[PDB]
Amino acid sequence: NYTTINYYRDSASNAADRVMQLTLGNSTITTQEAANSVVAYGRWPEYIKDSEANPVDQPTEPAVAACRFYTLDTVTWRKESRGWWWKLPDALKDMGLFGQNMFYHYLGRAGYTVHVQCNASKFHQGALGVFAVPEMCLAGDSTTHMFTKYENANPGEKGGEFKGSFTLDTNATNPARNFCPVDYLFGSGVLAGNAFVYPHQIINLRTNNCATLVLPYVNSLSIDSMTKHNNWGIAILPLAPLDFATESSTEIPITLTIAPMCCEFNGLRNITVPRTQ
Amino acid sequence: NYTTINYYRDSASNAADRVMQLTLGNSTITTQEAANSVVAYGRWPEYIKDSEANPVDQPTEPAVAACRFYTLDTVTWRKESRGWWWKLPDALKDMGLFGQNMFYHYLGRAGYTVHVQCNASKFHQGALGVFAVPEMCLAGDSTTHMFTKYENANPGEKGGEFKGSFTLDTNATNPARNFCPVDYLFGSGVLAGNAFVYPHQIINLRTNNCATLVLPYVNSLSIDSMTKHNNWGIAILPLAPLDFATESSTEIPITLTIAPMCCEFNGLRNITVPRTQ
Amino acid sequence: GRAGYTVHVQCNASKFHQGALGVFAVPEMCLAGDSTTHMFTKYENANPGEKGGEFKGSFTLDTNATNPARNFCPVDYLFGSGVLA
Amino acid sequence: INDSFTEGGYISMFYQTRVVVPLSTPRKMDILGFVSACNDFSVRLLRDTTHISQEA
Amino acid sequence: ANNLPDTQSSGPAHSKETPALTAVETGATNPLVPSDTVQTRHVIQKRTRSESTVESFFARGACVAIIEVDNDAPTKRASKLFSIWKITYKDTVQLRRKLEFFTYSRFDMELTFVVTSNYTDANNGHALNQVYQIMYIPPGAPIPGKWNDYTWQTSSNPSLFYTYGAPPARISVPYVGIANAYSHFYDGFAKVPLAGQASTEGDSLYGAASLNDFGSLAVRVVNDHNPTKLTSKIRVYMKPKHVRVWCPRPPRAVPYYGPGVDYKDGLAPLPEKGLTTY
Amino acid sequence: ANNLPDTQSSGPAHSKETPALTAVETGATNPLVPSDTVQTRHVIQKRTRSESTVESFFARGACVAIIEVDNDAPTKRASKLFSIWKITYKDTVQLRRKLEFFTYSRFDMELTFVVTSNYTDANNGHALNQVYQIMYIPPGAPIPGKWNDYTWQTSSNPSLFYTYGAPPARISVPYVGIANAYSHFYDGFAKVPLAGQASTEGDSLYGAASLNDFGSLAVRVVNDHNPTKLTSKIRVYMKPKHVRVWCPRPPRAVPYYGPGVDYKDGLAPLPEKGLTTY
Numbered sequence A, B: 001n002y003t004t005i006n007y008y009r010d011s012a013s014n015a016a017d018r019v020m021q022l023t024l025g026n027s028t029i030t031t032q033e034a035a036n037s038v039v040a041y042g043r044w045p046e047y048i049k050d051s052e053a054n055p056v057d058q059p060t061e062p063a064v065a066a067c068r069f070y071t072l073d074t075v076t077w078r079k080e081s082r083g084w085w086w087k088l089p090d091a092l093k094d095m096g097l098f099g100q101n102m103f104y105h106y107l108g109r110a111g112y113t114v115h116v117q118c119n120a121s122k123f124h125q126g127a128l129g130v131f132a133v134p135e136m137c138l139a140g141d142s143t144t145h146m147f148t149k150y151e152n153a154n155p156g157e158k159g160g161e162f163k164g165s166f167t168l169d170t171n172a173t174n175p176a177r178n179f180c181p182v183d184y185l186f187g188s189g190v191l192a193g194n195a196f197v198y199p200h201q202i203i204n205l206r207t208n209n210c211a212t213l214v215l216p217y218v219n220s221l222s223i224d225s226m227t228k229h230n231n232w233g234i235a236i237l238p239l240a241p242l243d244f245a246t247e248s249s250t251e252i253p254i255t256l257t258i259a260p261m262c263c264e265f266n267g268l269r270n271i272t273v274p275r276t277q
Numbered sequence C: 001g002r003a004g005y006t007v008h009v010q011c012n013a014s015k016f017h018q019g020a021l022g023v024f025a026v027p028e029m030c031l032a033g034d035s036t037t038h039m040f041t042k043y044e045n046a047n048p049g050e051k052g053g054e055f056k057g058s059f060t061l062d063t064n065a066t067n068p069a070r071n072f073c074p075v076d077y078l079f080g081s082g083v084l085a
Numbered sequence D: 001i002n003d004s005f006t007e008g009g010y011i012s013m014f015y016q017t018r019v020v021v022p023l024s025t026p027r028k029m030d031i032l033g034f035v036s037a038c039n040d041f042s043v044r045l046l047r048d049t050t051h052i053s054q055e056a
Numbered sequence E, F: 001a002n003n004l005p006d007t008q009s010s011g012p013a014h015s016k017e018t019p020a021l022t023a024v025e026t027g028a029t030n031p032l033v034p035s036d037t038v039q040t041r042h043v044i045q046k047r048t049r050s051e052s053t054v055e056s057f058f059a060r061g062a063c064v065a066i067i068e069v070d071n072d073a074p075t076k077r078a079s080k081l082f083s084i085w086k087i088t089y090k091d092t093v094q095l096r097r098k099l100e101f102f103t104y105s106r107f108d109m110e111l112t113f114v115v116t117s118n119y120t121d122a123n124n125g126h127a128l129n130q131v132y133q134i135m136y137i138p139p140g141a142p143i144p145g146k147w148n149d150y151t152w153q154t155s156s157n158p159s160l161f162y163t164y165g166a167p168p169a170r171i172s173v174p175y176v177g178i179a180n181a182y183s184h185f186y187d188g189f190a191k192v193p194l195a196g197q198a199s200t201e202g203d204s205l206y207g208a209a210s211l212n213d214f215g216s217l218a219v220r221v222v223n224d225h226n227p228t229k230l231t232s233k234i235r236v237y238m239k240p241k242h243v244r245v246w247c248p249r250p251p252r253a254v255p256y257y258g259p260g261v262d263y264k265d266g267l268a269p270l271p272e273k274g275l276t277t278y
């Protein structure tokens, strides 16, 4: 036994599976070759509780008007693809009434259902790692730290691509001020092979055609500014390169469908019009 | 949990609304355009309790003889007025039997009912802040600290005026030794806008014609010398300047009526005759 | 689509002003056109938007055959629909 | 402190209709502004202020 | 100090009750909450005002004096072998402002003495560890005239003997005011001049009284002088304890000028900013 | 933190149940144990994960700052009589990496100050024991411009007075984040640039916000200068206490380059080894 007694007031001073259907609003997704679906950290998206509400004004919950699947621009997977990234809610800023509520309010909160679709025949090869990264900070391309500008950090539904090797932006007069995400460094100075600590799913073309990730709202705050802060980052990397019948030049589309969930907005004002690239 | 044990004797060593009528004596005040009445710190004036009596000799309580409304000299509110101040009990030193008891006794104590009256038409503009300040110390006008003489510090029922800007008294041979209260510094090196921490009322000419403040006796002692120490200070500032129909040159009277309350005096002697200005 | 409405008309004036406004909610507020052709008002004019339209003191006929206005001609005392206001 | 990540917002005042006065009335008036905290207000991490300083 | 109230959910409102409209002329602050003007959710409040208490606000050691003493030699007229410091919080601004937030205060005090010493020259040898005597001299008590006169017997005066290198010395004092509270402000005089007597007589400084007379501290180095001069400084840190305060005042907005409320410089504390500039 | 499960004996198996075969596409880690693939004996486990707890992992004092100050003379322009250090854990790598294992953290902090001083020259005499003032300056508080300006009154700023030779100074801090947790990473900006305004306006550094603004520490030597210069260094050791963490991330694999996630050098962290070389 030992005896412990606190001699101070403040406690700081104390000693230390395959067939699935997803319906949101007026949108429905059917899948037959699914590898199940992952709920990030086992937490389903939810609305702010009265015990955690910071803003006092009544929130607006568009529900089905905004809690529905929006499909982003399709990308092409080739043998030379290094990977793609999107930022949420940034990727949905021009998507129906969700983007309208996003830009008309000072504070916004939403979870997501991300559905990545990549169908290929039984004679194709390749694997895609689909990772949901909270606070997916990406490295810049200049000797100046944290120098990436807002326009490039928020590409929108197109997102960005990973790079095979790091290139330094030496243009002093007109710096690019863009990201330089290196695929094997995961764009953030960490080995990509460890990226599986994040919620993820692998689309192995021999097994499944799609991946589904249910992202809860993750943040150090109950609600934040959606225009300032991207809660999530979706990163897709080719773990196994695409291959097909030795024909070469094969390319298959990857489509991304994101549904915001449990959307809450506070602080209605005039609409925000961010500066464009 | 934590454990605390005291190892010493002395505890110092331990760890840390509109229509109103006011009748006092043979005096009565009727108001129809009142903005209610403020009781400073929510404490009504009272007599010294036996549990707090420092002097042992029997007090004298003139009651109605001195606890009655005395009206001071009227001042004029113009567009150029910066404000006025009075000191209590100093403003009442020549007012009936109250002043007699004040000067015949070594110790005196009294609360007050201050009634500021300023009537103007429905086509006038202006607001007066009326502030009751305990220990209303005012800044002097010389490089010598605390150099204001008794005669100027106790003007009487006329009181003094605030100044727009600070002026330094450079007359070495015959220094003025007077106050220099700057209106926006509240005469004491503090912004006037914060003066509302003191008990106060605003006379907005569109709303009310009068202000009433019930000041309890406030002091670090139960009873003190009224000739040495001014318990209260009444400061009136134009928050909104006086204006009228663009005619200009308009001036309206401000009248001050103070009734001492719960007067107690101790230490009867020959009368005190203070030196005059 | 389906929706009810709360319409709030605001018109402040001093105590030295005169005037009265009738504010009427009309279901199926059909308005008369300005041409000899019946029911000839085009969609663009029938749906002005938030600006709306104005009533007219007297009825004017649109005789421009080449480029007809195809606009409404609501007469104030006829309430724009052939009925006394 | 003036901080981007913890910026507070914007207060503004506008005319809804306008200020109307009759004749023989001042056409220019003044408004006074006051601020205070609500009963849910709180502070922490006591520090030294920058509103007072001493010389020599 | 205790927990704040929770936030209750508020829906749309359509009624003749208008909490927003008020009349500040009454002098009363409108006690509105967010749910009165906007629709609010339910928030279970967990913030507290524990660090905003008057005890927490003053629960810091604040430097109030830097007393300089020397150990050189009796012959040297430029070295001050002892120093007398009138006890007051007005030699420094920060604690003075925090205290002058209020008209009256009543508290015990904790005095901490941080002593730092140094050499003044090199080619005169070295010194042994010094002992400092800090003698409290209440008003009326004899004041030392020399560093080694009889007054330092301290038969009755409380005295602190601090060995250099030991942790800073510390004492506690109860509330020692002759009134029922400390007067941060005294709107009056100690004398009333009487009609008839000469203008020289009866003249007293404004705002000065014996309420703030607390005696002084006499600090000396008990050691005899080494062949080399040693200069020491005692820093006095004052911590109010068991604080009660009364009659809050607006804080000092302009630089202090002397022990009173006088101002002479820096009368323009506010900067320039547009009316419609955010 | 608690005890691990025991190992159960496993005999030969012949069945249609195949724990070995799985599908990692689901994103789920197969929770197999040795008894599933090989025959195992019974082992009563006595090992524990007590030292792998998040509290143990961070229960070390980590140096985060080396603040250099001097005591030479006011005239000397090359001597820094006081030093201001923005509070952060990103001036050092080891604690930064251990913390950036996680996206969010929430903890009390323990700051330990180890002060070491030395002479810089010999033929100028010697010095007396020094007292150091470490003043915490929260954001918005006035920042000292001179080593002896009014800011050091510390009427409100918490201040530590450390006597040289005493054990390293120490204070504890509660969780002082304006958010509900500390953000190791912030994927955003403090400003949103608005259409219309000039490219100069609205431009904010990526990943920088006021979540990580904690003020600074101002360190000075309280003593007056001796005829010889003395150089001192305060080493700040930060120990998280009552640690909670959220959202684990892969640790930094390449050298840090600035306060953000930028990388510029050492992008080839892995060595060369044959595929079939043991």
Ligand SMILES: CCCCCCCCCCCCC/C=C/[C@H](O)[C@H](N)CO
Binding pocket: E087, E088, E089, E099, E105, E109, E111, E134, E135, E136, E158, E159, E160, E171, E173, E176, E182, E212, E214, E217, E238
């Ligand atoms: C042991 C000998 C030296 C140390 C003892 C000195 C004791 C002096 C304590 C009594 C005088 C100071 C009491 C409090 C000071 C001021 O009145 C307060 N700051 C008023 O707000």
Ligand SMILES: CCCCCCCCCCCCC/C=C/[C@H](O)[C@H](N)CO
Binding pocket: F087, F088, F089, F099, F105, F109, F111, F134, F135, F136, F158, F159, F160, F171, F173, F176, F182, F212, F214, F217, F238
């Ligand atoms: C007594 C005066 C000097 C010592 C007091 C300094 C107090 C500063 C403590 C608050 C600021 C630091 C709080 C924690 C630091 C970082 O946020 C954490 N490493 C975040 O992970």
